[PDB]
Ligand binder design. Sequence first.
Ligand SMILES: CCc1cc(C)nn1-c1ccc(N)cc1
Length: 298
Amino acid sequence: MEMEKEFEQIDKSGSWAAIYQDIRHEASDFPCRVAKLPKNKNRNRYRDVSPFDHSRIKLHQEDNDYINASLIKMEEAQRSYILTQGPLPNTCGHFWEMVWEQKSRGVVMLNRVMEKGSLKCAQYWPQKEEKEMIFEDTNLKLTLISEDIKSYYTVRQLELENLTTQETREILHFHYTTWPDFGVPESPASFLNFLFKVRESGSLSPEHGPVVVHCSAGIGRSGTFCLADTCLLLMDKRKDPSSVDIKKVLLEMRKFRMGLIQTADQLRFSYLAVIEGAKFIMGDSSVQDQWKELSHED
Ligand SMILES: CCc1cc(C)nn1-c1ccc(N)cc1
C-alpha cells in the first residue's frame, strides 16, 4: 500500500491523533540519569526533555561531560544525526565544543531565536562578520564568514577555531527561518527544498561527523527533519517507495531520543514531506507549487 493511499485514509478518517497516540504508547523508555543530576539542571531547557544515557553525546572535558544532545544512528539508512536542544545562554560553548569534537560539518536550525515573544534559544552564532564570538569556557572562537538569505531559509558559512591549537574549520549553518509560530507549514515544499540544499552541501556525507540538528527542545521540528531524510534514504536503498513504513522508522528513531515528533500535526507533516519528496525525486515538479487564490484574510 502506497504511503499516499495510507495518507488519504488517515485524513478521511481524521485519525492522525489516534495514530500519534499509538506511537507514543509504543515508544521506548530508557533511563536518563545523567540528565537528571542536580548539577545539570541549568543545562536543560525543559525538565521533561532529556537525552537517554545510552545515546547521549559526551563532551570530552573532565569538568562536566553533559549536554542535552543525542546520537541518532540509523543503521539501515547508513546515516547518523545529532539531535539537540537550542543552546541556552550558558551552553553555547558546550554546543560548539560538541560540533568540534564530533567533527560535524553542518548545523541545522529549525526555529527562530525569538518566537511568540519568547526566547527559544540563545543567539549562539554571530550576526555580523566583524563581531566574532569567543566562548571562554571551551576555548573556541566563531566568526561569521558569509550568509545567503533566501525566502524560506538562510545558509551561513562560519569559521570555528580551536583556540588551544589554532586549528580552524568551516561550518555550514542551515537555518530554516519560516516555520510558523503555530502549527506546521501548510505545504512541505520549502522544507524539502531546504533538506535537499543540506544534502547538496555534503554535510550529510559519511566523510563528516553527524549533522547537528536542533529546534527549541530538539525533538519536534528536529524530529521531522531527521525522519523525512531517513525515510527518503530508505526508499532509495530498498528501491521500493512502498516498503517504507514511516511509523516504524519513527519508532526506531525514538530508541535514540525521546519524544521525536511532538504533535499529530507534525506526524501528518512528516508524512506529507516524505510523500511529496519521493514524488519530486520521481519527476513531479507540481509538489513544489504553492499557488493560492487571491485572498486578503489578514
Ligand atoms: C558510514 C556512514 C554511516 C553509517 C551510520 C549509521 N551513520 N553513518 C554516518 C553518515 C553520515 C554522517 N555525516 C555521519 C555518520
